[PDB]
Symmetry: C3
Subunit: 30 residues, 3 copies
């Protein structure tokens, strides 16, 4: 139902935030 | 409700499109 | 409706998995 969808949004939003962190590291590490 | 979920989909979809643009720049800039 | 939302989640989840594959290739190819 709606609650299930909202829980999958939050997971997707955490997948995206981590991707953004990896992208930053690819550009700036070192 | 459903409308709220659809508005968070559209935001997620814009987060992803920008990520794809940054990935392209990482590979091809210069 | 809910089914439509679930179909857009699955698409988003495939967009993310491919992004993760491209990120891995950027780091490790070669
Ligand atoms: Cu969603």
């Amino acid at each position: 139902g709606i609650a299930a969808i909202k829980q999958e949004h939050a997971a997707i939003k955490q997948e995206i935030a981590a991707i953004k962190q990896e992208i930053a590291a690819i550009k700036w590490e070192g």
